[PDB]
Each structure stands twice: as C-alpha cells, then as structure tokens.
Design a protein around this ligand. Structure first.
Ligand SMILES: O=C(O)C[C@H](NC(=O)CP(=O)(O)O)C(=O)O
Lengths: 313, 305, 312
C-alpha cells in the first residue's frame, strides 16, 4: 500500500453534488474532456470502456440528459441498459439500486425528488452519477456550464457572468455561481425581478469567497458588460398572486436580437435547457448563441466522468 | 459516391432509377443479414430513434438494421416524455450520427431535416407520410410480382389518414402504366393532394366501393388499418368507417393466383386470420423486407453507394 | 456439444432434476465469465428483443444485462402495452411473428396469463417467459432453487419455510414444485388462514416424496429451517376487502427478533419487491440473501440465453 504517484483511481466514488469539486479537480476533468473531444471527432471507434455496462434510471424522464450519458458511454465503447421512464407494490429506491448494481458497472439516475442521489450513492457499491436530483443538484450540468465558459471565452479567471431569470429557485444558476467562486477575479451579475432574486446563502458564499457580485433588474445594461449571459426562465407561477409584478417584468428578462445588439462581439449566450420564449428564435442565428454547443459539451464532460469513474486516471 | 439524398422524408424525393438501385442494395443487405459473420459497415456510427407515437416494426427494424451493420443505437420509445422540435433535434444531433423520428405532427420530419446537419429519416409524421414503408412496399411488390410497370394496385381502407398509402402512391407514380384503385368508406377517402399529384403525373386512378370486383382485377391488394388515433374525438366516424372492407377467404377466392395481399400492419379485424395461411398473404414477408430496406438506407445515408 | 432440450423457457414443468443440476453448473460458469476482466463474445451477433407488456425494470435489466455480458445485443421495449403497436390493437401473435423478423430470442413479460404459451407457439425462435401475468415466472423459480443450492450447499435434505399468500402465490407454488424434484426435502407453509396453500400443491408434494407441515408460528418454524422464503402480501388478491388485506398484511414479519431465532447459516430469501414484511434491520445480517438472490438471476439468465442460442 506504499506505491504512490505514477506507481490510479478517481478520488470521487460518485458524482452527486458541486461541493465535491475543487479548482484543481475541475481543471483536470476539463483536461480529460478535451481529450474526449478528440476521441469523439475521430473516425475510429474507442474501446476505452469496452466490457463496462451503464444502467440509466430516469425516474424523471429527460431525453436530452439521458441520451447525452448513453451516447457518452457508447462513444467510449461501453454499453447501456436503458430505462427512459423508471417511475412505476413496494419498492424503495434503495432496493432498486441494490438489484440493478448487480447488472451494471455504473448507474446514472435522474429523480424527481431531491435527496435521491445521495441515498443511491450511499446504497450502491458501484459508482452513481446524479443526472438531476429533483429540483436540487445537477452536478454535470454545472460542470459542463463551467467547461463551456472556459471553451468559449478562453478563461475562467477574470470573467464577468450574468445569471438571469429565476435566481431564487434555480438550481442551475445557483450551482454555476457555486463553481465559479473557485476561480479568481470573477464578477457575477444577478439579473432578475426582486421577487426571484438570488437567495442569501449564495450571496454570502460569494462574498466569503471574495467574488464580486451585483444585483440588477436592467438586463440591457448588464449584458453590455459581460462575457457570458446565462439565461433561465421565470415561470409565471413564481409571481404567485402578484399579477402586478408579472406585468412589470413582462418583456424585461428576455434574450432577443435587441439584447444581442448591445453585447460584446466575443460574449456568449448560454442556457441549460429546455429553452422557451425567454430566448427568441432569432437569437439562435447569432454565432454567440452557445446553448447547443453547451449541450454538446455535456457529451465530452460526461465521457470524461464515465472514464474516470470506471477506469480511473 | 455519396448518396444523392441527405434525408429520407418524402416519397417524392425518389426517382425510378434511384428506387431500382436501392432495391439492389437491399438484396445485398439480405445477404449480410442471412450471413453468420458480423458486419462492420457502420462501426462507429450511432442512431438515435425518437418515437413520439407507438411502433413495433418501424422502430425495431431500424434498430436491428443498425446493429446488423455494426452500428449502435440510442433509443427513445416515448419521446413525448415543451421545447420546440428544433431544440430537440439540435440537442440529439450532438449525440448521434443519424436520427430516425416518428412524430405525431405532419411536417415534423421536414422541419427536423431542415434544422439538423446529420441525416434524418421520417419514420412517420402524423398522418402525413411514411417514406420507408413505401420503399419496402414497392420492394416487396417487385419481389413478389416480379414487376412494377403495368401493375394494378388496390389501396383499401383508411386512405385519408394513411401515411403509408400516401407515400406509396408517390412511389407508384414513378413507374409506367400503373393503375391504382381506391377502395374506402367515404369518411376516409384519399385526400385531394394525392389525387391531384397522380392526375398531374398521368397515373390512372379510380374510386370504387366494390372490393370483390376490384380485387379480382389487381396484382396487389394493399389493406390498411382504420387509423383510430387520427379521428380525434370523432369516435362516431371511427366506428362508422370500420367493418366495411374486409380481406377474408371469400375475397382471396376471387383473386388471381399470382396476386398478393399486403398490409403495413398492425391489422385489427380487416384481414381475417384464415387469410394468413394463403401463400398470397404477403404482409409478414413485407415486414421482414423492411429490415433489408432500412439496412440499405442507413448504409447509403452514412457511407454512400 | 449438443442442442438444448428445451426450445423455450415457459413453465416449471419443463424441468427435471438432471436438467436443473446441469443448468446450475452452467450458471456457475456464467458467474466466472461475469467476474472476468475480459468481455465475453459467446453471444456476439445474436439479438434479443425484450417485450415488457408489464414494465419491470429489475427483471428486464437482468435479462438485458445477461445478454450483453455474453456479448449479445438487445432491442428494448420497456413498455410494450403503451409504446409498441399493441397500443394500436395488435394481437400478441402478430407482434411475436413480426418481432422474430428482427431478433434471435424474445424475452416477454405479460400482464395476462397464457401469453407466454401463445408466444412460444407462434415463434420459430426461442421465447423466454419473464412473467406471465399471475401465472408462471420460470426463471424466478430457477434462480430461487439455484440460490438455495449456492447458499446452503445442497438441495437434498433441506428444510424450507414458504411464508405469505400461499394460495395464489406463483413464486412459492413454483418453488415448491421444483424443490420436489430433490430428495428428503421438508417444506413448512406459514400463512394467514385465508390464503393457505391450495390442495393441488399439497397433493403433488405428498406424492412426490416431500414432507410438509402447516404452521401459524413463524418463530417456531424459522428456528428449524435452512431457508425462510418470504413474500409480499398483495392487495389485489383481496378484491374489494381492504380490511382483509390489512388484517393479513402485518401478521408474519421477518424482523430482528425472527433473525434472532434462526440458525447460524440459514438464509432469508424474498423474490422482490418487498414492502414492510422484511424490516430494514434484517438487511444488515449476512443471512439476508435476497440481494444475492437477485444477482443470481443474472447468472441463471445468462445460462439460459447461452443454452437456447448456442447449446450445451
Ligand atoms: O399504423 C398503421 O396502421 C400503419 C403504419 N404502421 C407501421 O409503420 C408499423 P409500426 O407501427 O409497427 O412501426 C403506421 O402508419 O405507423
């Protein structure tokens, strides 16, 4: 047990939550994801994960998320046991995990209830990847978001990112803010109506981490100063019975051609998806519309994590 | 050289010479499928199946075809699970090399092809078209009757909503001296867009309500299911359209010895079970042929001629 | 090398003692394959179609994993009732006849008993019954017997308690049926009175050389058995009498106190899923064998796929 360094397993046994990652780990995972890009663009079929089986358990169905993981597995030469609709007499999640783990080498689970992923990881003796834990953690979304910024902008230190939309309740913007705080000289703009502003826990965490942040309800002003505009929807229900606030916000938190008109030439638009009319279809025609390149980057990040969890470094 | 089509969406995309060449490739794919050795033609390629409506033959034949050629498959049997179709397609194309989609809306497959930079195959777009059914149907006719020029074909059943017979009519129009009979309840007669296309193409067609007479004169009797899911809330019209045109032993008794019965499947009551024993009952051979035709299309779209 | 004597795996009565023992030996070979670092290619080139008219993630994945661990491939239908063309009204026979055009073996779980026999008669390729509504589930019975052999070390001379709804339980009836092919077996029947084991099984056991005993005292029985085989009380079997379901439900529980009276090397089995009839505490005991049991289903199902497609 004395062998060290080159004389190796991934330090994570499961991928469950953002707080598992530090800056050095992110940088190394992103290095692996760049290698996975090279593999996926090659004409030659990879055999890195030949002989390994992934079981997907989508209790909350997600065609996009599931296919990204299943594609990642097959692009590496692994195979897949698919369950696109795992929601179905007496079965705890723990009993399903303890059965399915006998049939597979890795489990990818998306659930509709927060807390499921931690329970599955604690139960399983094979690696678990959380593919979305109800409205809670979605760690590979956060990883692919940061990777996309690094790819598109060329750096993570010193950038300005606008987080737009349902900041109070949105796991994607909260988790992205959490990981960005691991880099240096980051400035975050929180753009939203007051009723869905970012909660104090993330604000206090950013301040404690030395991250500059600013709240604004003026998307046109913020977007002109940012490298990244990261958009999410504010659903009508989040205004509750306050129709006056819904009407005051109408048309004010949309990414449209006019917004792109004030943005820098090398800035980007991101969106974790699914996207509705909070990004207009016209925006898609702009090279700065990065949300489908972002989704593609999920393939490379998920390839990297499957490789690391199954065969290590 | 590369395949002249970038997508397989509409029956009108195919010309006569292309059809004959595809049929040759299908016969080569039958040799692969019967062989003991595992093909690697499509090694490294991934197909995404996106099925928004139920399917047995179309989805499984495409998936089997891909695997028999050495490619692999990402399956979605329940894609209705919202975002636009264009968002779904631009996402899924990042994960795959070809998309096979059955959608519930007519026109969806052409929208998908216009958005995607990888080949799209229309596995059925609402009551619109079903081009690979039409391809395997014409391949089956050629295989069973030995000719396409000069044949007489009866299209029977729910023609209005039948994406199968709509695409098949487009392909039959590429051959010479074809006669098509339309036999249906009035409720579900063939739509005017198909009628107008055949008339403009110079294809002789005739509506009749006398299936015994029509069947006695045809090389092919192509029966269809009354398309319940397309009737919406008009379940009155659905039940009224059923039971009027049945392929049974008495109908086979007036048909020529060299004629065939086809059906894209599934059938409910409209072909009786005792027809299956007749050598002219071709609908299970027809379904098997879809494997070879879909192998041919995957090969052509991904690696060319 | 020779052909497997079965063309399909449909029902327990297809199996005799010699066949069971031979399949269990193959299953041990499959365990060695599954533990190996090398991908098997025994079933390279073969295709399985799964047709789960009654969705069952655990059962379906066990079969699909078995196929892929042997190097074969799979055409999946997770919910054939809703997403195959059965949803358009297609008969089972037409579905099976069609699907064999794309595949080499069909694994089907249906909601209606009699479906598996119909599929086998229609198909000219092997069919495996993965659960025939309330009827036969033959690979569950096979993996159950295999698990006993593996955990206890023998099948001759064992004592097994079958606990739960014995009257209608396909798993306990089918397990009793196969255990009777071995020698000097004793079976204890523990159940609420309303769902006692029916006379057809009792008479078969008596005439097959199996001693059996009814008891309502699980604590007494469990101290004398190699195997306590627990099942879930199912609401549907009580019709329009929820009150009778609730009365039956909590009467026979495998809990820490029951484990405390069991023998040192006895085991607890359960076909799954379970509700509360095995308490969570029990999972911590090495004698809790129901997850090893589920894993053994992989090896048994690998063995059957191999035998049906490439023989002995
Ligand atoms: O459904 C029909 O009746 C005809 C046609 N049938 C098929 O394509 C066969 P399947 O639905 O099994 O793929 C269709 O339009 O979907």
């Amino acid at each position: 047990g004395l062998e060290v360094l080159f004389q190796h397993m991934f330090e994570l046994s499961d991928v469950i939550e953002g707080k598992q990652f530090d800056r050095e780990m992110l940088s190394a995972i992103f290095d692996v994801a760049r290698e996975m890009e090279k593999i996926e663009k090659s004409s030659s079929q990879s055999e890195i994960l030949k002989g390994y089986l992934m079981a997907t358990l989508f209790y909350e169905p997600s065609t996009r998320t599931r296919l990204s993981f299943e594609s990642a597995m097959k692009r590496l030469g692994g195979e897949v046991l698919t369950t696109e609709n795992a929601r179905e007499k007496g079965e705890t999640l723990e009993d399903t995990i303890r059965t399915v783990e006998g049939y597979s080498d890795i489990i990818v689970m998306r659930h509709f209830e927060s807390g499921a992923a931690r329970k599955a990881a604690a139960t399983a003796n094979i690696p678990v990847i959380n593919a979305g834990d109800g409205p809670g953690e979605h760690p590979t979304q956060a990883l692919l978001d940061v990777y996309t910024i690094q790819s598109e902008i060329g750096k993570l230190d010193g950038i300005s990112v606008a987080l737009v939309g349902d900041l109070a309740n949105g796991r994607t913007v909260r988790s992205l803010a959490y990981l960005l705080a691991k880099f240096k000289d980051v400035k975050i703009y929180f753009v939203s109506p007051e009723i869905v502003k970012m909660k104090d826990d993330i604000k206090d965490y950013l301040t404690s981490s030395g991250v500059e942040w600013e709240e604004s309800s003026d998307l046109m002003e913020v977007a002109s100063k940012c490298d990244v505009v990261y958009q999410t929807r504010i659903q009508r229900e989040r205004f509750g019975e306050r129709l006056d606030l819904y009407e005051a916000a109408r048309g004010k938190f949309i990414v449209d051609k006019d917004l792109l008109g004030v943005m820098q030439k090398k800035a980007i638009i991101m969106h974790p998806l699914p996207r509705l009319d909070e990004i207009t279809a016209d925006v898609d025609a702009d090279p700065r519309a990065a949300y489908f390149r972002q989704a593609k980057n999920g393939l490379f990040i998920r390839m990297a994590l499957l490789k690391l969890l199954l065969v290590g470094w």
